[PDB]
Amino acid sequence: MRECISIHVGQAGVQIGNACWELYCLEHGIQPDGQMPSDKTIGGGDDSFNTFFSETGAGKHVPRAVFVDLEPTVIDEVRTGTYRQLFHPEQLITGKEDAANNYARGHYTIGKEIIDLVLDRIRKLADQCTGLQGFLVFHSFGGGTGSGFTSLLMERLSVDYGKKSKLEFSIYPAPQVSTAVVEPYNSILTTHTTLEHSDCAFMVDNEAIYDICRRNLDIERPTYTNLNRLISQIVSSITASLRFDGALNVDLTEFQTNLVPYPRIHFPLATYAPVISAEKAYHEQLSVAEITNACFEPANQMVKCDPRHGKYMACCLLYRGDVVPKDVNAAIATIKTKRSIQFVDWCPTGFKVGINYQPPTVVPGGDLAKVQRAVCMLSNTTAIAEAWARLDHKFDLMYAKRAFVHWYVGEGMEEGEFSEAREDMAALEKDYEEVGVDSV
Amino acid sequence: MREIVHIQAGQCGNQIGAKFWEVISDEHGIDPTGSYHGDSDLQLERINVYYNEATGNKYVPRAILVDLEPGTMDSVRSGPFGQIFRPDNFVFGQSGAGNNWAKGHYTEGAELVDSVLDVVRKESESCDCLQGFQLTHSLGGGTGSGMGTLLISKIREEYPDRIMNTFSVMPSPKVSDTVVEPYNATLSVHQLVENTDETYCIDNEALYDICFRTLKLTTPTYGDLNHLVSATMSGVTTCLRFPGQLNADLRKLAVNMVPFPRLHFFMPGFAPLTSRGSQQYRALTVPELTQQMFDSKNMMAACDPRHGRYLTVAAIFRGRMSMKEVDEQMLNVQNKNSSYFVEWIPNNVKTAVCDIPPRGLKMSATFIGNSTAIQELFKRISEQFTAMFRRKAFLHWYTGEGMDEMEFTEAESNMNDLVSEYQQYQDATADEQ
Amino acid sequence: ASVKVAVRVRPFNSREMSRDSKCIIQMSGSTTTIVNPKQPKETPKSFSFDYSYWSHTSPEDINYASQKQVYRDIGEEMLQHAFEGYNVCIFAYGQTGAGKSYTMMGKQEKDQQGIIPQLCEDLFSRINDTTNDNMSYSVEVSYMEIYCERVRDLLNPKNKGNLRVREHPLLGPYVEDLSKLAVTSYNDIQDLMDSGNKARTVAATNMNETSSRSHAVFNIIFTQKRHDAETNITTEKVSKISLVDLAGSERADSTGAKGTRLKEGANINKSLTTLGKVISALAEMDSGPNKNKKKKKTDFILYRDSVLTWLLRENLGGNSRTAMVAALSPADINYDETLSTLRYADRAKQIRCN
Ligand SMILES: CC(=O)O[C@H]1C(=O)[C@@]2(C)[C@H]([C@H](OC(=O)c3ccccc3)[C@]3(O)C[C@H](OC(=O)[C@H](O)[C@@H](NC(=O)c4ccccc4)c4ccccc4)C(C)=C1C3(C)C)[C@]1(OC(C)=O)CO[C@@H]1C[C@@H]2O
Ligand SMILES: Nc1nc2c(ncn2[C@@H]2O[C@H](COP(=O)(O)OP(=O)(O)OP(=O)(O)O)[C@@H](O)[C@H]2O)c(=O)[nH]1
Ligand SMILES: Nc1nc2c(ncn2[C@@H]2O[C@H](COP(=O)(O)OP(=O)(O)O)[C@@H](O)[C@H]2O)c(=O)[nH]1
Ligand SMILES: [Mg+2]
C-alpha cells in the first residue's frame, strides 16, 4: 500500500539500520522476536503497518530491508545479536575480503559477483508490495563497500525500476575530523553517481552531531549509538506521515515536489529542535514557536554550514504531536519578519507545513527526554556550497602530487575518470551560484 | 572468512614466532595440548583466522617453521608450546648457513625451498579465501635472511593479490652481533623492497631502550623483546578477529597508509606501559594513551621522529571508548605538531576501534607509522656497506658460492634510490630554485 | 628533456563508412574539440596540445597535414638530435582501432608512409652518402615486450622465458641475453619487425578481437667511428633510438572477464599512469633550464616505479628528446575511448585553452 523498502549499504548503513529498526519496533509494539501482543490485547486493528513491515499468517512480522556489506564482522553482530529472530535469514552478506576504502574495488572488482543476488532479493521484496512509493538508501562516503556499492546499486535501480523515488541518507566527511586518508577521493568519485540518479539526497556530518551532543545533552563522551539514534529519529519524523493519521499529511511525492526547485539542486539539510536532556527537560515551555525558532539556529544544524552566508530556496516543516495550526501560522509569521533568514526573491511562499498526531517515542536508555512536541525542519540552502568547497580543496591538494592513485588504478579505473567527476562537482557548485542570484 | 598464513625463517624469526603463538593462544584461550578452554564464545567467532580444526576438536596452528640449524627446532619442540605445531611443517636441513647470504640464497636454500613451497602451497589451498602471509626474520643473518627473501620472491610470483607482510629485525647502529651484517642487510633489503606491500621496522637497540628506560627492568633478556614484538604483531592483526565500532582490515591498512608503491616501510609501536609499579598512579584514558603513543622513547625503530615529518600514521585501538576522545585527540595532535606533518595531505591519520580489549587491560593501542626519519637507519647501513666494499673486506666468501660483483652494486644503487625518494618529502617547504 | 605531444585523427575505415557514421572531432590552430552524441545540448569539451593533425580527405586547403609534414615536425628533428650523439624516444598511443599503425607504419604505396619507414630511409641514405674513407657506421636492432612487469624477447624463437634486468654501474639498466641482430638497410628493419610482431602476446576481449596485452619496445643502437690519420681511433658516439608501442588503457567494465584478463589490464593501467607522471616531471624539468633556470637539486625524477621506465632510463632523461603521438577515432561510437585518449594527452605539459 504505502511501502518504503529500505537498503543499508556499508557499516554506517548497518548501524543506522540497527538504530532505526529499534526505534520502529518500539514505536509499533513489535517485540524483538516478531510477535505482537498489542493487537491481540486490542482484538483487531492495524498495528502491523505496511509502511515498514510485512505480516505472515502465524502472527510473525518481518521487516522490509536488506543489509548488504562486504565485511562479515559487521553483519554477524546483528545475525547473532538480540534481533537475530526478526530479520529474514537473507541478510545477504558477502563472504569475501573488504574493498579497503577503494572505490574501484567496491565498484567492479569485488562489488561485482554480489549485485545480481542483491537485485534479485530486492525484486522479491518489491513483488510483495502494491505500493512502493519510495526507496530509502543509507550510506556513508568513504569508499570501499559503501560508496562503490551504493553507486552500482543506484545505477542498476534507476534503469530497472523507472520513476520510483529514491531518497538517500548519506554521511559526509567533516572538515577537520576524518577517519580515512582516501575519503576526499571517494566522495569526489561518488558525486558523479549520486547527482544523476538520487532524486533527493540528504546530508549529515559527524562533527555537527558531535557538537550538538556536547552542548545540548551535556554528554561529554558520545559514541556512535547516539548519532545513530538522532538519525533514526530524523528518518522516523520524515516517514511518520505515511503511517499515522494527521490533520495535514505529506507523502513522499510532496517532499519530492516542494523541496526541490530544479533537478540539480536537490541536496537539502535537516535538524531537530527539542534535542533536550532529561535534567533540562523541565524549566522550558517547549511551545511551537520556540521549537520552530530553534530549528533555524545555526548552532543546531546537522551539517557544518553557516546559513547566514546564504539564502533559503524552500523549506518544509513536519510537526509531530499536539500542535494546532494557529500556533504554526503564528510561528511562521514571526519567523518570516527577521532579516537574518534571507529568502530568495523567486519563491515568495517558501514554506510547507505538516502535522502528525502521534507524539515521539522514547527509546529505553538512550539520551533523549520525553517531549510532547517536536518538529523536523528540512530546507534547501545555498550555504551548503561552502560544505563542498573545503572538501574540494582537499582533493585539489592531493590529486596534484598523484598520491594513492596506484591502488585505484590497479583495480580497473582509468586515470582520466577522476577529472570528469571533479568537473561535475564544480558544475554543481556553479549551478548553486547561478540560482541564488537575485532576479533583475 | 579471512585467513593468513605464517612462515618463520631463522633463529630470531622462530623465537618471535614461538612467543607470538604463545601470546595468541593465551588471547584465544587455547590449551597447550590443543584443547579449548575459554570464558566466552566470542573467542571462537573467528578462530579460522589463525588456526585449523581437527578430528578430536583440537585446534592446530597454521605455521611453517623453516631453518637450517636443527638446534632451534629441537629447542622449540621441547618448549612450553612445542607440541602445538603439527610435526609435518617442521622442514629443515643441516650444515647451516654460517651467516652468509650467498649460502642461504643460491647454494643451500635451493634444496629446502622446494619442500617449503610444497607445504605453503598445501596450506594455502586449504583456506577458504587466503588474505595474506606473514614472515619473520633477522636481516643480519644468512639463514633467515636469504631463505626469507627467496620465499618472498617465490610467493609473490605464485600468488600476486595477497598482502605479504613482514615483521623483520634490522642491524642496530651500535649494538653489533655479527661482522658481515651490512652486506646481508643491504642485499636482503634490496631483494625485499620490490616484493612486499607492508614491511615493519624493528631495531634491537630501540627494544632495549624501551625495556630499560620505560619498563624499568633490570636484566632484560630475549624473552621481553620477543614479547614486545609479539604484542605489536597481534595488535596489528587484531581487527580481523573480533568485531568493533569500526574495523581495519589488512588491505584497508595497505590502501590507506602507503602513499606511493615504493615507500612501504613502517615504524611500529605499542601502548601503554606502566613499568610494573606505576600502574597504581597512571590513569588509563585516551589522551594519556595517545600521548605515550607518539612519544619518541616508545618507538621501536631507533629513529627519532622529530626530523621526519610523518607521511602517514594508523592507530588501531582496542577497548570500549567513546570516539569523540579519539577524534579530538588525533586532531589536537595534528594541530599542535604541525611542523612534524606533511602539508599536501590535508589530514593524515587513520583510526580504528575494537570493542574487545586484551585480557588484563582496560584499553590498549597499536601504532603503525610511516615517517621519513627511517632514512637515518638505511643510510647508516649504506655507510658501513661502502666502508667494507671499497677494500673488499670479506667479499671472497660470497664469490666462493657463485655470486657476481654486480649484484652488490645493484643493491647499493637501489638503497641510495630508496633513501633519495624518502628524502624529497622531507624539507618543510619547496619555494626554491 | 624536450617533450612534444601530437594528436592525430584518422579518416573513416570500411566498417565506419558502411554504416551512417558521423564525425565528432573538430580541430583548429592548436586546439581540439569534441561533442558528446549522448547529450549534444550541454557543451563541447575542448583541449589544447602541442600539435594537432586533421586528416580526412586529400585537398583540405585549411589545416591538412600530410605524412611528410608530421615527419618534418617530429622525426627529422629527432633523427638530427640522434646523429649528434644523444638519445631519442618516440611513443605511440591509441586505443584499438584508433590508427596508431596508420601513423607509425602507413601504407607501402611510397606516397603516404609512416614515421618509421621515412626515418629508416633517411638514416640509411645519410649513412650511405657520408661513408668516406674516414667515417664508418654500424646499426643494431632489438625488439622486446614488457608484460606484467616481465620482459620477453620477440625476435628470438627460443622458449618464452622471463629474462633478468640488471644495472651495469656505467651503462645503466639493461637486459641479460636479449637477442641482437645486425642490419644494413630498410628491407631488414622490417622483416624483423614483422617477425617480432607475429610473436607478440595477444588475446580477445569484449572490446575487440585482437586487442593487445603488452607494451613493445623497438631499440636501435647506432654506433659511429672516425678513422683519423693516426692510431688513436675511437667511437665516442653511441646513440639509442627507442620506439615504444604502448598498449591501450581499459576499464574493467569493458573487459568483462575475471581472472587473468583483469590482471593484465590492471598492470597495464599502472604503467600507463606512472610513465605519465615521469614525463609530467620531465616537461616541468624541461621548463626549468628553458625559462626560469631552475637547476638546484637533481629534482631526481622518480624513475624506478615500474619496469617500463626503469628500462628506458637513459633514453628519457639526461639531455634526450621525447615525442609522443596519440591517435584518435572520429567515429561517434567510440566517444569514451577518444575522451580517455584526449584526457591522457592533456597531461604531459598541460596547456591552457586559448
Ligand atoms: C598483571 C597485569 O595486568 O599487569 C600488566 C602490565 O603491567 C603491563 C605493563 C604488561 C606487562 O608486559 C610486560 O611487562 C612486558 C614485558 C616484555 C615485553 C613487553 C611487555 C605484562 O607482563 C603482560 C600482561 O599482558 C597479558 O597478560 C596479555 O594477555 C598479553 N599477553 C602476554 O604477554 C601474556 C602474559 C601472561 C601470560 C600469557 C600471555 C597480550 C596483550 C595484548 C595482545 C596479546 C597479548 C599484562 C596484562 C601485564 C603484565 C603481566 C605485567 C604490558 O604487556 C602487555 C602486552 O600487556 C607491557 O605493556 C603492557 C601494559 C600492561 O599494563
Ligand atoms: N555516523 C556513523 N558513521 C559511520 C558508522 N559506521 C561507519 N561510519 C562511517 O564510515 C566511514 C568508514 O568508511 P566505510 O566505507 O563506511 O567503512 P565500511 O562501511 O566498513 O566499508 P569499508 O571502508 O570498505 O571498510 C567513517 O568515516 C565513518 O564516518 C556509524 O555507525 N555511524
Ligand atoms: N629481536 C630479537 N633478535 C634476535 C633474537 N635472537 C637473535 N636475534 C638477532 O638475530 C641476529 C642473528 O641472525 P640469525 O637469525 O641468528 O642468523 P642465523 O644464525 O644464520 O639463523 C642477531 O643480529 C641478533 O640481534 C631475539 O630473540 N630477538
Ligand atoms: Mg567496510
Numbering used by the authors:
A (entry chain A): 1 to 440
B (entry chain B): 1 to 433
C (entry chain K): 4 to 357
Sentences from the study reporting this entry:
KIF1A, a key member of the kinesin-3 family, is recognized for its high processivity and fast MT plus-end-directed motility. These attributes are crucial for the long-distance transport of cargoes in neurons. Mutations in the microtubule-associated motor protein KIF1A lead to severe neurological conditions known as KIF1A-associated neurological disorders (KAND). Here, we present 2.7-3.5 Å resolution structures of dimeric microtubule-bound KIF1A, including the pathogenic P305L mutant, across various nucleotide states.
To advance structure-based drug development, we determined high-resolution structures of KIF1A harboring the KAND-associated P305L mutation in complex with MTs, using the same nucleotide conditions as those for MT-bound WT KIF1A. In the ADP and Apo states, it shows a one-head-bound open conformation. Weak densities corresponding to α- and/or β-tubulin tails connecting to the motor domain were detected in all nucleotide states, suggesting that the P305L mutation does not prevent interactions between the K-loop and the α and β-tubulin tails. P305 is a key component of the MT-binding interface, located within the highly conserved loop-12 motif, (PYRD/E), which forms a 310-helix in various kinesins, including KIF1A90. The integrity of the 310-helix remains intact, with most changes occurring towards the N-terminal side of the mutation. A notable divergence in the P305L mutant is the reorientation of F303 due to clash with the introduced leucine residue. The P305L mutation alters the structure of the KIF1A MT interface, hindering the transition to the strongly bound configuration (from step 1 to step 2).
